[PDB]
Ligand binder design. Structure first.
Ligand SMILES: CP(=O)(O)OC1CCCCC1
Ligand SMILES: CP(=O)(O)OC1CCCCC1
Ligand SMILES: [Co+2]
Ligand SMILES: [Co+2]
Ligand SMILES: [Co+2]
Ligand SMILES: [Co+2]
Lengths: 327, 327
């Protein structure tokens, strides 16, 4: 009923339309403070983020969950500033993604548990801002360290009730390995979202996880490099599957009785330094709507395909509410 | 005429006895701010660092060059606080070591040149504290990215006059490849220190580089894991060669007429998170003197072996002053 946001505790009824997997900035630990000029300036990044979230709010969005971890360069002070200026609730994250520095990668499962617990129970850095979600990641078969992160995430979740959201290489069916590891720790499937699931057309994989109680993250609907096959870097990241094909997976899962298991988002950002230099400009040209892509283009598309507004309201309001609530 | 420290510009004479390769904290970008409890607390680390530097000061040290780069988790505000309370000048560093995150590893030579220049000319983060040295690294044959860092370092040094200091896998003769890359950029050998040179006994390698005008960094004299062969992690880090063996390389270069090419240090720290958890405790047990090891143990050892006082004063005061001075 009460979740932690970057502005403090709010009631779950106030969350409303929620985008479950977003980023204010896709960067690296300490990078934004050390080289803000990469993004023009910190002020330019703040202004871009505020304009984007205000446009998303005008379109219907009330809350975004920033799944940026320590290693994605999460700066909660930036999240707080943007949240207040745009009047959009932002849920901060803990956990580790696939670029942890030596000081993180050499740690034991017990040490990582205390770090994730510190960020949820005490606060992130010296801000007092508490995390409301744990972000973990695997890119194919889990490395010994990634297995420790998954276990530590599960132990932190059981102690606080806070949910776990994942990054997967969906074509490699990573969700199954993640699921098995979470369940070996006693974590309930209802507290986990298997993300980047829209990167695959394998419905047998998605429905099986959904049947076990897992939340399915169809979280990168506008990600498409169709038309830009000459740009090798944009093709490798955005993929060659259309926004429509990704959006039709939402309909496919509703039609198989799993409307309560779907979580939708854009996996968008306002700053991107962890890849090639031109990537943010390339991405903004592909999708000028940004985070507003879900209520402006995806919801009307699904209404046109036959999905009722009540089901779409259930996926964007009711589902994230149940997922984010500490249980 | 003036060297930039964490407390502002100082004259050449104010530098005095200088330790050319040290660290206040050996960590990772953003780590100290995100998990200060790893070091007990930030207050505990500051207090330990201030005591250790005051110990070094009473023994003769007036300046240390903290070669902690962005990726070693350099926190210039921590450096400034410790410097003020201990009354020991600290020269901060720019550059990149062997743990760059995605946002750094994906950058071009031009972009990295602008980052290093920003840290020398403008300042580090939002502190206004300017770096007075560029730290780079290779661990065997240079990787494509490490070659870009060395080139960017050379271009940054040529525009500012600030020197370059390196980390080497000395047994692999890395200094020769580093030298070839620096010289191809038009960088003068007198502006470069080939560090970790005390990790090898190959005198023909050290003398050839010294004859070419390079400064030889015999920078980790107390590093020895003799007596603790049971500790796999400490053995792989510190090595099996004695401090005496490392210190006899200073005498060996003085005997072959390269007194002017020697830079001595401890490569010590007060906090260490980029390795195994108990490493700082193990290191403090091996060498309780810390940064005071050079004037308390190495200087009297060399005095007993036949090296005169004016020669040792030349290595510890004159050589660093000439190296650090922007030329
Ligand atoms: C490879 P991944 O989909 O995690 O990349 C993310 C893209 C959005 C910013 C954070 C990184
Ligand atoms: C031999 P290496 O430079 O990796 O070890 C250092 C120890 C002090 C902190 C920075 C790292
Ligand atoms: Co991801
Ligand atoms: Co993401
Ligand atoms: Co080193
Ligand atoms: Co060092």
């Amino acid at each position: 009923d009460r979740i932690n946001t970057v502005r403090g505790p709010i009631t779950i009824s106030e969350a409303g339309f929620t985008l479950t997997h977003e980023h204010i900035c896709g960067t690296s630990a300490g990078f934004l403070r050390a080289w803000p000029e990469f993004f023009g300036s910190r002020k330019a990044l703040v202004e871009k983020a505020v304009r984007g979230l205000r446009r998303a709010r005008a379109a219907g969005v009330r809350t975004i969950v920033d799944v940026s971890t320590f290693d994605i360069g999460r700066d909660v002070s930036l999240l707080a500033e943007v949240s207040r200026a745009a009047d959009v609730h932002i849920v901060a994250a803990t956990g580790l993604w696939f670029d942890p520095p030596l000081s993180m990668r050499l740690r034991s499962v017990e040490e990582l548990t205390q770090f994730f617990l510190r960020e949820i129970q005490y606060g992130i850095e010296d801000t007092g801002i508490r995390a409301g979600i744990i972000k973990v990641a695997t890119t194919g078969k889990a490395t010994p360290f990634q297995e420790l992160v998954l276990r530590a995430a599960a132990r932190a979740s059981l102690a606080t009730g806070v949910p776990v959201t994942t990054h997967t290489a969906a074509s490699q069916r990573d969700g199954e390995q993640q699921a098995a590891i979470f369940e070996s720790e006693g974590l309930s499937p209802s507290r986990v979202c298997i993300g980047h699931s829209d990167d695959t057309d394998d419905l047998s994989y998605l429905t099986a996880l959904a049947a076990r109680g897992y939340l399915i993250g169809l979280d990168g609907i506008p990600w498409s490099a169709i038309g830009l096959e000459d740009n090798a870097s944009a093709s490798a990241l955005l993929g060659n599957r259309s926004w429509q094909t990704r959006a039709l997976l939402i309909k496919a899962l509703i039609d198989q009785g799993y409307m309560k298991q779907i979580l939708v988002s854009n996996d968008w950002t306002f700053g991107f330094s962890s890849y090639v230099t031109n990537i943010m400009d390339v991405m903004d040209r592909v999708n000028p709507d940004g985070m507003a892509f879900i209520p402006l283009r995806v919801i009307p598309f699904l209404r046109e395909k036959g999905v009722p507004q009540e089901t779409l309201a259930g996926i964007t309001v009711t589902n994230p509410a149940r997922f984010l609530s500490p249980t």
